[PDB]
Each structure stands twice: as structure tokens, then as C-alpha cells.
Amino acid sequence: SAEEAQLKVWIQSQIHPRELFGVLSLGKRAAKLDDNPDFVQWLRLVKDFRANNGNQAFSDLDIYYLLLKTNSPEQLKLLFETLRHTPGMTKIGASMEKSLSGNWIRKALEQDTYPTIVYNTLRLKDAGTKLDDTPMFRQWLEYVEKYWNKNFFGDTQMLTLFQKTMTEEEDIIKLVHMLRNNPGMKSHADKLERYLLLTSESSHKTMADVWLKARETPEEVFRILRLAEKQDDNRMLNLWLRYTQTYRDKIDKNAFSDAEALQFFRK
């Protein structure tokens, strides 16, 4: 058999699966079992390479983060389901699904493990701009929320991890504004939004575009910036007024005018 002999060649050669993944150009297309015999063969090599060298030689996460570069978390979830229910592939599919299930928070919670450590046990830096779509990231948000309700790990240190995961500020801003949707994080996200706005001029234009795309009301933004608290020489006030006029221009035509906004602020 042509496929059976090719597999032998790779095994005898001791070629590393990352190297083979590259030369077979499996990054150029969807990781599916249909119309992709090169991928199926690649899995067969991975299987054998693990048996002969141990799982750490090419881990679940090595596999996950390689495929994540050119497939979505949702595709990979369905992929591992299919492997778990394909004869010959059941062991590895189940290994992957176990590695991505979340069955570590209870045993790791009580243990009192620093989120930073867990963040890099999970190798979330390797997720890149896909971070906020990965299930493991969502799981880590659970372990942080629970770690806080116990007893120290702070909002700035969380932001540091995000910045060592992806380089572009626009990606960092969209990420933090997506955390608003997670209630219980909404508190800390809003704080990070302010921290960026007070430490980076480039953030202002980007942040205003993110709110505008999300159709956020002037009232909501006023709430994020916490302008009701104690403070015409105020950078945050100017920013809010500029967002408000953009909102009035692009979305409502009937929101706060300049005068009305200033009145709202006086309260």
C-alpha cells in the first residue's frame, strides 16, 4: 500500500511532526479528514511518534497551537470530536478533548496556583490574536474569577500577559472591550480601558472606533470613564465629548449635543 509505505519512510527517518507539517503544507488548508489524506497520514505519524518518544515529545498543546494558526477553535473542536469517533484515531481525539475540557480548575483552584503560572501551563501566549475565541482562555477567566474569591494577582499583571500574547494595541483594545461581555470581569476590564487611555495617546482613536463599532451609547462610555467621580483641562472629558459627537454624527443624530453633554457631566 502506497500510504502504508510512506508512513514507514517517515518513521524510519525520525522526521519531527512540526517539520513534516511544514513540508506537507498542511497550514495552507482546513484540518479536515475529508479530501486531506496528507493530514490523515500526518496524524498517523504523530500517533507513532508519541508512542515511541512519549507525549511530551509532541504534546496536545503543540498540536493545538500549530493547528490554531490556520484553523478556528470551533473547527478544531469539531475536528477532535471526529477523531474521537474515527477507528484508529480514538485515543488521540480523546487525549485532545481531555486537554481542552477544563478539568483542572478544581484541583488547581484549592492548590492556589498563580494565574500567571496557569496562563503559561495553558500556553495562552501562543494563541496570538485568536486568544479571546479559545476555550482555554475562557477557562482561565473562570480560574481567575474564582482565585480572587479566595486569597495576589492584579489587573495590570493580566494586561501584561495579554501584551506578551499579541503585539498590536488594536487587538489588545478589542480584547479588553470583549471582556465586558463576561460579567464579573466587566469591573476589571473597564479599569484596564481607563489605564490604557491614561498611558497611550494612540489608544484614544482606536478605542473610540471600537466603541463606535460596538454602538456603545454616550451614557455607557461616561460610565466606563467614571466621569461622575471627582476630577476643560481634562483629557478624559474631551475624549468623551469627541466620542459623543461622533455618535451623534454616525448613529443617533438625536443624542447629546455639545451643550447637553456638558450639562449631563454637571451632575
Numbering used by the authors: 97 to 247, 251 to 330, 335 to 370
Quote the paper.
The P. infestans RXLR-type effector PexRD54 (PITG_09316) perturbs host-selective autophagy for the benefit of the pathogen via interaction with ATG8CL. Recently, a P. infestans RXLR effector, PexRD54, which contains an AIM sequence Trp-Glu-Ile-Val “WEIV” positioned at the C terminus (residues 378–381), was identified. It was shown that PexRD54 specifically interacts with a member of the ATG8 family of proteins from potato, ATG8CL, in vitro and in planta. In plant cells, PexRD54 activates selective autophagy by increasing the number of ATG8CL-containing autophagosomes and stabilizing ATG8CL.
To discover the molecular architecture of PexRD54, we determined the crystal structure of the effector domain of this protein (residues Val-92 to Val-381) at 2.90 Å resolution. Although PexRD54 could be crystallized alone, the crystal that gave rise to the best x-ray dataset was obtained from a sample including both PexRD54 and ATG8CL after co-expression in E. coli (see under “Experimental Procedures”). Although SDS-polyacrylamide gel analysis of dissolved crystals showed that both proteins were present in these crystals, no electron density for ATG8CL was observed. Five N-terminal residues (92–96), the residues in two loops (248–250 and 331–334), and 11 C-terminal residues (371–381), which include the AIM motif, were not included in the final model due to poor electron density in these regions. The structure of PexRD54 includes 16 α-helices. Our structural analysis revealed that PexRD54 includes five tandem WY domains that pack to form an elongated molecule. This is a conformation not yet observed for RXLR effectors with multiple WY domains. The WY domain is a conserved structural unit consisting of three α-helices and two characteristic hydrophobic amino acids, frequently W (Trp) and Y (Tyr), which contribute to a stable hydrophobic core. Interestingly, in PexRD54, the C-terminal helices of WY-1, WY-3, and WY-4 are positioned such that they also serve as N-terminal helical extensions to WY-2, WY-4, and WY-5 to build four-helical bundles as observed in AVR3a4 (42), AVR3a11, and ATR1. Finally, PexRD54:WY-3 does not have an N-terminal helix and does not form a four helical bundle. This correlates with a significant kink in the PexRD54 structure between WY-2 and WY-3.
